[PDB]
Design an enzyme around this catalytic site. Structure first.
Site, mmCIF file in Angstrom:
data_model
loop_
_atom_site.group_PDB
_atom_site.id
_atom_site.type_symbol
_atom_site.label_atom_id
_atom_site.label_comp_id
_atom_site.label_asym_id
_atom_site.label_seq_id
_atom_site.Cartn_x
_atom_site.Cartn_y
_atom_site.Cartn_z
ATOM 1 N N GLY A 9 0.777 -1.236 0.000
ATOM 2 C CA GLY A 9 0.000 0.000 0.000
ATOM 3 C C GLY A 9 0.808 1.285 0.000
ATOM 4 N N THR A 10 0.088 2.399 -0.119
ATOM 5 C CA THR A 10 0.640 3.754 -0.082
ATOM 6 C C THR A 10 1.367 4.050 1.238
ATOM 7 O OG1 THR A 10 -0.481 5.188 -1.701
ATOM 8 C CG2 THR A 10 -0.350 6.005 0.559
#
Lengths: 250, 111, 243, 244, 242, 244, 233, 241, 198
Positions: free
Chosen positions: D30-31
């Protein structure tokens, strides 16, 4: 969440065997040796206090437990399984008997209640059978003294004398030689200490041995006076000193 | 002891013509001997060319009109925007009212 | 068939592998802890290892205050540790409310051990990969050390150790008690009992500690409390003026 | 044998819970998002990958508020993070209802912790696919926390998770060393903006949007507020200047 | 094993797809909608000459304005018909009117996906999807004569003509060429009889085949064997004509 | 999930057999042999104790012959603990009937009810069947002396003479050979002991390995009497029948 | 690999993936193409309806949720019925309890949270449908893209379904143009029809094949089908 | 609690648990039913794996649901009781509410409905039972005979058989039953029934039981002799050729 | 209340039940049969609360008929009465109790003796040579205490009932529109269609 295990974990195999019960009995077989001998005027149940560390206090762990003032229990196998069974057995003695009839259950019926609890752990959804075999010794007015063995299957049988766990095979054999229908309680305690010695590797004394009896009423252990019909408990656990005194007459 | 009901007074009137219908009602709302409002609408347009007024206990009246308006909305959702006919609207209101048979909407309702 | 290692059912050998693997989780944190009894106190020492520089060291703890009287140190992952902590606190508060007196150390131990036994028998509940050492100065039994495991086993100790290097600490303590012939540390002040625990922690592990390498909880009559970094520093200064 | 990684609550022979570790892989994918604890508050910042020009700028908000004093940001499976914040809000409301005072940050931290740990106890539930950085100001100072899929959490001076967590952690470590006296709320917003831009280099293929929020005792009255307008652009420039 | 509501890597529901295979083994059912009414015809398909053919009930009445035909596991259709009949009558009780054919079909299709061992959405207590497809045919004032194909998937399509069952793919290709927007009721009746004859393993007669229709005037009626026999006779003569 | 560990105890085999029922019957085929023989003036129940020791208390022991009613008794083959569960529910059912109708429960009604309970664990619940086979010996004023048998499938039948447990094939052949419709209880007592003595897997047939019960209408009374033989009483009849 | 970790939604893969969710996402790509786009005054849904036979109808793709909100579907139609009906209730609840029209952003949060619950629990399955929600609320025109994974994104324009990339590239290019089509509904719809036709391949959009919906400033959410879309073909 | 879906679809579109439930029926003892002009006759074969039974008390194969309706079956005996009991309860419930005994069709439709329910409910297996339901509708003299199976499908037959070797006996009936002239007598109806059973039973006087249902609750079971007399007469029909 | 009378003679039990159904101001029916046949040799008469009266009777009838089919056997009059008593004993402590008083007249085929049971709505069962419910017993019991013998024939019992009905027609305030008389013996249950002037 929610127990989704609503199905049996013990099932019949093609051979007719109930795997989980067999394996529970295997777990019992690895457990420390415990025994029981029935005399004419009492019953003796004994086991070895296998201290898992010398830093541990073996007194704070009772392998022999009082269920009712006239009934005691000992085991071989899984300690934690035994402990929770004792709690359940003590409660079922009240809920299913004393709260109804105003008196403690006879040995055979409390054994039957314990056997029922263990039976259900064989059939009920999402559980394993109890990994213990129990030796329950007790007394009641109409049946006298009795000794029962309760297995993981929930099956129970009465005994004159028997042993379970590690060296059960050898211990049972020795008991068959020494048992008779004329034994006094003290003689049974003596035979109990003899049979248990063959099972103990290390130290053999009143601190490594746990022994209790179902004999005469103990008015000194009642806690009160004034009721003639109340004469005290028949269950008595022998002190570390009381064991050593009899070990000198070994 | 707590009384769930009250009386907000007022009066409603409905007359059907040959190709029209009127539903009238005073805009007075009261409690005992006091006026709550000199202008509180009582007759409502519920869509599908249906006008409705449930006069009596205003809290029950509003709740019924609100539930019927929402019933018209869901009638379109469930039946491909079909128009709720006046006969169908009436029967629908019967079930809305009889739904609370043992704790009634204390209102006289006219559509 | 091979699922006897996935859920808590017996293996052909009568073993429960999930309980055994839960025991293995207890050493995941690489933290050693020991508990000793004083004359009228109980002291728990646990290694404190804060690797990340971004961590707030004041929040890193494996010692919990269960009640006014009872303290608990955990060996194992922190999520399971806090799961066991909250439950113990909830059980301790309820007992007091229902029975009118403070829950004894041994009773809480039994209660937590019984709960752990249930996960050993029931299939949907997994065992907690933790070992719980409960300490207090019980109003009946005095200084108390009671320890529970994933198997549901519990017992009282004169002294105990837990962690990867448990055996080294255990034998060290054993040898002292074989020598002293008593089941406790014959000292009036808890400060010296803490010092004893730190001393034998050093001897057994062969490692020197700073004020931030350790974590201490002391149980006394009517109170359990944890030491601060400076309270520990004071203790480390005293042991230095002996060696 | 094998297959210890197919069910959630199963222990592997080495005492691990593989399903939890598999949930971490979703987080790492993820980010990147961060948290900086300052002298009287906390600052939260997150990378927002611009998939296309069609994404309406400044609209798809990621940082969430719990109560009125707590801010939560997460990396990984966004729906899972929302689910956790939804629970956190119920959990905070339950506390305030009974105890009157708004939930303390360490108190709130454990509430999320116990709930996440609960999803590692049964095979009927899946572990959370998010690492959540959260915190705020309470009765006694500011607190910063980071929560793992395992249920594990600690207090942090600086916290980072996601794609460029290493770049972030490295920058956070420099700040802790160079500011033993403590960073200010104003400075932490600028510094957060820089750390995100620097940690974006582990995803430099796609263009991104910056999102900052903060909870400071002096700057926001101890309430959680989003960094907007002039203060946002000031921080955006501070980063864009030090990226070169 | 594997869940009853599991997705395939292609994005399909295993149980729903396998349910469609069960319908493929079912007896043929054909529906043809005209501006004069909708005709429903089925293949009885008795498994033995000792089986009393008239006891085969594969065309049923839902309401006076709605009837349906079934294909596949016919036993699964009983609760669907029960739900449909109740939904029709219940709507009439609430609204003093006939339920729209499309609305009735949608209500039947709402049951379709109500299966699982504990799907988080409501309380879908049903171990598997239905093993039967339905041809719901009726009339209402809003959309006139209609024919719907209800599947265990939950999706329903409106057809001008549709064939379901064993000889569906062949019969559907036949309906494709034969159907036009100006067919009469009699033309449709014969057309159902003709195409059934083509796909049926047995020689079509008034005993192994059943006809029915729905018209605004008389509603849903199942054709008695004597009426169908004449239409079969009329069909044979018109085929032998060229 | 949990499905992984589900044995599915209530499913059909490709042949149309019930796995768990078949395997439960296999389990019973190893349990001590129980025999029931119905005569004109009574019924005889006999059972061989599986596994005994010198130290096994036989006086206080009962593992195969249980009293359900004052008119109905059972012989058990299989899991003793499973049997006691079913026995208790049967004892309750008998008392429910007596309270409802002020009449003793007809033998078949009690038998059917127990067999229906067994059938339940065969069709639903996902639990294992009871590994128990019963031989019912009973009397009512409708059919007189009745002998039934039930197994894990939940199927029950009536018999003039029947055996359950171990060596049923050998026992049934010997029973079908020497049974006569006009038999007397004393003849049946002998037949029961002779059949067991020939099907025994042990060396000799001694009293300590046997349980015995008869249901007779003692002529000098007019009522039905159940007699569960005592160890000494079994020892006596064992000598008289010429087995010593 | 994959085969061992795709049995249910409750299972993570070694790489951290949820295959049951990804499989549900594949049902969308198999679904017929639909396009959403907005200006500052209006929001438009243009959907390609799919038919089974030439004797069947073209299955509807657009559902109305309220007077100010609606959505277009791509994937399993019954799942779209479930989610649209849930959204209908949430819009309805907001009106009855608060006398307040449900914000489009909030509607997206609610759909996200409902989809998520089907991705973490055993026995359940992920929804097998993508949704494009349009609406005019107190903050103007809106367009949202809903994915079964639980991911909801607010966009100026987008497309989901088969060949949807063609329409998505066009809108990404036409961005500066259509965003300014304010006060002119017909031009915004034409811009959507030009978008959707970038995803054609099999046929050309006919009268009983095209489906268009619109909402805005003084336009309640209304659906156009058949004869009503003839002036756009 | 237990709701695991046991009856489910397979790749080929089959429900194996229902399919295997029919295999249990194939295993069960043969049962036959033929309807005459004024009666229905039910015949059932008796097993011989074990012989020493008490015929008085051993549950018979033909069961009365009501005074006018009977039910015979093939398959698992234990399962059949549950169906019979539920049918018997519904029979009384119908009389209590409708004030008129069940029609044979309705009773059949109910039994089939129960069977179908067990094919798509959680945590249950289908009934390993197929049934033959025969009798006469209230105030009606037209004979009725229906058949059900594990799937829940039901239908009426002029003559039908279920169980082991039902394949053989059905063939006999297919080439021995004329719909134009059904057995116009109770006697010739029972004869056709015994004849069809003798094709499979293989000399079984005690292995064959017959029940005759006539209009207006007239149900009677034949004794061994009455049946044995039919067997004797039938064996002569062969030898006289 | 309605008139419910029962009398056990030598070989039969005879039940007499009033034919009137009165609701408020009007006599709605004068040909009501206040009885149900539970089994071929067991008959039960009833009186009490408007709705409960028939509802309970039909419920009991259904259960006995279900038992009869399940067992292929007829329960003894004692067994049926014990079942009915328990049902009323449950009812009395429920939310809304059945307010029904019953007389159960049956011929025990096993004992070859007639039996009459009286059970009120509380579940108070007693076996009697003759029984009555409501105010009927206040006039009839003293009559039957005087004129009853256990060896009386069915005809003697019908003459004895006639004497009871006559007393109830003279001294009772309500017009109960005569009675329906039914005889329960070894041959089952039959109705005396000629009691209007016997």
């Amino acid at each position: 969440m929610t127990d989704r295990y609503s199905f049996s974990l013990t099932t019949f195999s093609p051979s007719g065997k109930l795997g989980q019960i067999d394996y529970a009995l295997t777990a019992v077989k690895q457990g420390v040796t415990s025994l029981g001998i029935k005399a004419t005027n009492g019953v003796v149940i004994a086991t070895e206090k296998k201290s898992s560390s010398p830093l541990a206090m073996s007194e704070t762990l009772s392998k022999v437990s009082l269920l009712t003032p006239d009934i005691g229990a000992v085991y071989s196998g899984m300690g934690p399984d035994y402990r929770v069974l004792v709690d359940k057995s003590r409660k079922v003695a009240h809920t299913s008997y004393k709260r109804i009839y105003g008196e403690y259950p006879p040995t055979k019926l409390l054994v039957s209640e314990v056997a029922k609890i263990m039976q259900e752990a064989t059939q009920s959804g999402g559980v394993r059978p109890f990994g213990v075999s129990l030796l329950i010794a007790g007394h009641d007015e109409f049946n006298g003294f009795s000794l029962y063995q309760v297995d993981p299957s929930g099956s129970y049988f009465p005994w004159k004398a028997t042993a379970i766990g590690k060296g059960s095979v050898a211990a049972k054999t020795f008991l068959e030689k020494r048992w008779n229908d004329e034994l006094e309680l003290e003689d049974a305690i003596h035979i109990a200490l003899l049979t248990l010695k063959e099972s103990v590797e290390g130290e053999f004394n009143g601190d490594t041995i746990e022994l209790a009896i179902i004999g005469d009423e103990n008015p000194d252990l009642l806690g009160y006076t004034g009721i003639p019909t109340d004469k005290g408990p028949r269950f008595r656990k022998l002190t570390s000193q009381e064991i050593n005194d009899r070990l000198e007459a070994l | 002891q707590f009384n769930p009901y009250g009386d907000n007074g007022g009066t409603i009137l409905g007359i059907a013509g040959e190709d029209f219908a009127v539903l009238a009602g005073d805009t007075r709302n009261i409690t005992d001997y006091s006026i709550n409002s000199r202008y509180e609408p009582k007759v409502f347009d519920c869509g599908d060319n249906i006008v409705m007024s449930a006069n009596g206990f205003a809290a029950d009246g509003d709740a019924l009109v609100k539930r019927f308006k929402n019933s018209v909305k869901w009638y379109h959702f469930d039946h491909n925007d079909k128009k709720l006919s006046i006969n169908s609207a009436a029967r629908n209101i019967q079930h809305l009212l009889y739904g609370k048979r043992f704790f009634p909407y204390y209102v006289h309702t006219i559509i | 068939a091979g699922y006897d290692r996935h859920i808590t059912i017996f293996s052909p050998e009568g073993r429960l592998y999930q309980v055994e693997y839960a025991f293995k989780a207890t050493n995941q944190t690489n933290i050693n802890s020991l508990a000793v009894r004083g004359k009228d106190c109980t002291v728990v020492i646990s290694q404190k290892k804060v690797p990340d520089k971004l961590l707030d060291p004041t929040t890193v703890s494996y010692i919990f205050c269960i009640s006014r009287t009872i303290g608990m140190v955990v060996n194992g992952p922190i999520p399971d540790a806090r799961n066991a902590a909250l439950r113990a606190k909830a059980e301790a508060a309820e007992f007091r409310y229902k029975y009118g007196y403070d829950m004894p150390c041994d009773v809480l131990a039994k209660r937590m051990a019984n709960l752990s036994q249930i996960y050993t028998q029931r299939a949907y509940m997994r065992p907690l990969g933790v070992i719980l050492t409960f300490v207090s100065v019980d109003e009946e039994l005095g200084p108390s050390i009671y320890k529970t495991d994933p198997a549901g086993y519990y017992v009282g100790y004169k002294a105990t150790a837990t962690g990867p290097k448990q055996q080294e600490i255990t034998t060290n303590l054993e040898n002292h008690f074989k020598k002293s012939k008593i089941d406790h540390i014959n000292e009036e002040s808890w400060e010296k009992v803490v010092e004893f625990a730190i001393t034998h922690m050093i001897d057994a592990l062969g490692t020197e500690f700073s004020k931030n390498d350790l974590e201490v909880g002391v149980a006394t009559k009517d109170k359990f409390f944890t030491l601060s970094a400076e309270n520990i520093e004071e203790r480390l200064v005293a042991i230095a003026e002996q060696d | 044998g094998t297959g210890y990684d197919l069910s959630n609550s199963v222990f592997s022979p080495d005492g691990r819970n593989f399903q939890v570790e598999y949930a971490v892989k979703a987080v790492e994918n993820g980010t990147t998002s961060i948290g900086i604890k300052c002298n009287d508050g906390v600052v939260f910042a997150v990378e927002k990958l611009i998939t296309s020009k069609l994404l309406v700028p400044q609209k798809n908000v990621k940082i969430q508020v719990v109560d009125r004093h707590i801010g939560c940001v997460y990396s990984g499976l966004i729906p899972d993070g929302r689910h956790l914040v939804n629970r956190g809000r119920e959990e905070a409301a339950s506390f305030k209802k009974l105890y009157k005072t708004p939930i303390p940050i360490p108190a709130f931290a454990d509430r999320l912790g116990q709930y996440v740990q609960a999803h590692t106890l049964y095979n009927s539930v899946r572990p959370f696919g998010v690492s959540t950085i959260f915190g705020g100001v309470d009765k006694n100072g500011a607190h910063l926390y980071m929560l793992e899929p395992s249920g594990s959490y600690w207090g942090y001076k600086g916290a980072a998770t996601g794609k460029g967590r290493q770049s972030a952690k490295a920058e956070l470590e420099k700040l802790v060393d160079h500011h033993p006296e403590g960073l200010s709320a104003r400075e932490a917003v600028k510094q957060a903006a820089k750390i995100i831009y620097l940690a974006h280099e582990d995803n430099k293929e796609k263009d991104f949007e910056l999102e900052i929020s903060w909870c400071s005792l002096s700057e926001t009255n101890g309430l959680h507020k989003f960094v907007k307008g002039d203060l946002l652009q000031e921080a955006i420039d501070f980063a864009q200047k030090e990226i070169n | 094993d594997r869940g009853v509501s599991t997705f395939s890597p292609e994005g399909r529901l295993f149980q729903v797809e396998y349910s469609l295979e069960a319908i493929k083994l079912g007896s043929t059912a054909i529906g043809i909608a005209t501006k004069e009414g909708v005709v429903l015809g089925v293949e009885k398909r008795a498994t033995s000459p000792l089986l009393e053919s008239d006891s085969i009930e594969k065309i049923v009445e839902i309401d006076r304005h709605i009837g349906c035909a079934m294909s596949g596991l016919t036993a699964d259709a009983r609760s669907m018909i029960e739900h449909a009949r109740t939904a029709a009558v219940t709507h009439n009780l609430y609204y003093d009117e006939d339920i729209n054919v499309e609305s009735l079909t949608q209500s039947v299709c709402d049951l379709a996906l109500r299966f699982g061992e504990g799907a988080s959405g409501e309380e879908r207590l049903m171990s598997r999807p239905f093993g039967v497809a339905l041809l719901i045919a009726g009339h209402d004032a809003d959309d006139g004569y209609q024919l719907f194909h209800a599947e265990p998937s939950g999706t329903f399509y409106r057809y001008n003509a549709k064939a379901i069952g064993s000889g569906s793919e062949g019969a559907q290709a036949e309906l494709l060429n034969e159907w036009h927007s100006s067919l009469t009721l009699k033309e449709a009746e014969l057309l159902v009889l003709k195409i059934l004859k083509q796909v049926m393993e047995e020689k079509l007669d008034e005993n192994n085949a059943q006809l029915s229709c729905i018209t605004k005037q008389d509603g849903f009626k199942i054709y008695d064997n004597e009426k169908t026999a004449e239409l079969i006779k009329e069909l044979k003569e018109k085929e032998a004509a060229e | 999930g949990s499905r992984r560990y589900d044995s599915r105890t209530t499913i059909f085999s490709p042949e149309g057999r019930l796995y768990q029922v078949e395997y439960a019957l296999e389990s019973i085929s190893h349990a001590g042999t129980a025999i029931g023989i119905m005569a004109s003036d009574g019924i005889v129940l006999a059972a061989e104790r599986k596994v005994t020791s010198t130290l096994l208390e036989q006086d206080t022991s009962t593992e195969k012959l249980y009293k359900l009613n004052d008119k109905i008794a059972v012989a058990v083959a299989g899991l003793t603990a499973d049997a006691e569960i079913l026995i208790n529910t049967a004892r309750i059912h008998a008392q429910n009937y007596l309270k409802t109708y002020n009449e003793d429960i007809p033998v078949e009604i009690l038998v059917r009810r127990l067999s229906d309970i067994k059938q339940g664990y065969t069709q639903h619940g996902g639990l294992r069947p009871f590994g128990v086979s019963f031989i019912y010996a009973g009397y009512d004023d409708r059919y007189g002396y009745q002998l039934y048998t039930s197994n894990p499938s939940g199927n029950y039948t009536g018999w003039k003479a029947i055996s359950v447990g171990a060596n049923t094939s050998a026992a049934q052949t010997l029973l079908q050979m020497d049974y006569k419709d006009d038999m007397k209880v004393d003849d049946a007592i002998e037949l029961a002991l002779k059949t067991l003595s020939k099907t025994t897997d042990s060396s000799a047939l001694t009293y300590d390995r046997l349980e015995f019960a008869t249901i007779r209408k003692g002529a000098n009374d007019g009522e039905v009497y159940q007699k569960i033989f005592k160890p000494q009483e079994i020892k006596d009849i064992l000598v008289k029948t010429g087995i010593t | 690999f994959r085969n061992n970790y795709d049995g249910d939604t409750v299972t993570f893969s070694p790489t951290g993936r949820l295959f049951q969710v990804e499989y549900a996402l594949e049902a969308i790509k198999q679904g017929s193409v639909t396009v959403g786009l907005r200006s500052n005054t209006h929001a438009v849904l243009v959907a390609l309806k799919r038919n089974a036979d030439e004797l069947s109808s073209y299955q509807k793709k657009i559902i109305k949720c309220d007077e100010h909100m609606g959505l277009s579907l791509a994937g399993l139609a019954p799942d779209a019925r479930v989610l649209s009906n849930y959204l209908r209730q949430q819009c309805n609840y907001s009106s009855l309890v608060f006398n307040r029209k449900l914000a489009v952003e909030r509607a997206g949060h609610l759909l996200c949270d409902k989809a998520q619950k089907n991705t973490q629990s055993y026995g359940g399955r992920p929804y097998g449908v993508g949704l494009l929600i349009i609406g005019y609320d107190k903050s103007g025109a809106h367009l949202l893209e809903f994915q079964p994974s639980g991911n909801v994104t607010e966009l100026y324009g987008t497309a989901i379904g088969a060949r949807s990339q063609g329409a998505k590239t066009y809108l990404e290019r036409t961005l500066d143009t259509f965003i300014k089509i304010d006060g002119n509904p017909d031009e915004l719809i034409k811009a959507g029809v030009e978008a959707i036709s970038q995803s054609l391949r099999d046929e050309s959009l006919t009268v009983d094949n095209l489906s268009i919906a619109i909402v805005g400033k003084d336009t309640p959410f209304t659906i156009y089908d058949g004869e009503a879309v003839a002036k756009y073909i | 609690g237990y709701d695991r879906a046991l009856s489910i679809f397979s790749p080929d579109g089959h429900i194996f648990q229902v399919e295997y439930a029919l295999e249990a029926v194939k295993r069960g003892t043969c049962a036959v039913g033929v309807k005459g002009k004024n009666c229905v006759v039910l015949g059932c074969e008796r097993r011989s794996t074990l012989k020493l039974q008490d015929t008085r008390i051993t549950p018979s194969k033909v069961s009365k649901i009501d005074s006018h309706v009977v039910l015979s079956f093939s398959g698992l005996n234990a399962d059949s009781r549950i169906l019979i009991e539920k049918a018997r309860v519904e029979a009384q419930s119908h009389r209590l509410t409708l004030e008129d005994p069940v029609t044979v069709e309705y009773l059949t439709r109910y039994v089939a409905g129960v069977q179908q329910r067990y094919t798509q409910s959680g945590g249950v297996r289908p009934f390993g039972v197929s049934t033959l339901i025969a009798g006469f509708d209230p105030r009606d003299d037209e004979p009725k005979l229906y058949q059900t199976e594990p799937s829940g499908i039901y239908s009426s037959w002029s003559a039908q058989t279920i169980g082991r070797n039902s394949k053989t006996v059905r063939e006999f009936l297919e080439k021995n039953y004329d719909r134009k002239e059904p057995p116009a007598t109770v006697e010739e109806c029972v004869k056709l029934t015994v004849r069809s059973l003798l094709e499979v039973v293989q000399t079984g006087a005690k292995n064959i039981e017959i029940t005759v249902v006539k209009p207006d609750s007239d149900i009677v079971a034949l004794s061994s002799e009455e049946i044995n007399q039919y067997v004797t007469q039938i064996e002569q029909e062969k030898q006289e050729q | 209340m309605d008139i419910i009378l029962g009398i056990r003679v030598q070989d039969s039990v005879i039940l007499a039940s009033s034919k009137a159904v009165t609701r408020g101001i009007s006599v709605l029916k004068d040909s009501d049969d206040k009885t149900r046949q539970l089994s071929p040799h067991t008959l039960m008469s009833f009186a009490g609360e408007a709705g409960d009266t028939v509802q309970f009777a039909e419920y009991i009838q259904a259960n006995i008929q279900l038992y009869s089919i399940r067992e292929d056997y007829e329960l003894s009059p004692q067994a049926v009465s014990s079942f009915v008593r328990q049902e009323l004993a449950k009812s009395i402590r429920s939310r809304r109790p059945y307010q029904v008083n019953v007389l159960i007249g049956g011929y025990d085929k096993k004992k070859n003796k007639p039996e009459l049971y009286q059970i009120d709505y509380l579940g108070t069962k007693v076996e009697l040579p003759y029984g009555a419910h409501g105010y009927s017993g206040f006039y009839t019991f003293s009559l039957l205490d005087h004129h009853y013998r256990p060896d009386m024939t069915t005809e003697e019992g019908l003459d004895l009932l006639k004497l009871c009905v006559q007393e109830l027609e003279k001294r009772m305030p309500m017009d109960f529109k005569g009675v329906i008389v039914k005889i329960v013996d070894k041959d089952g249950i039959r109705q005396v269609d000629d009691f209007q002037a016997q």
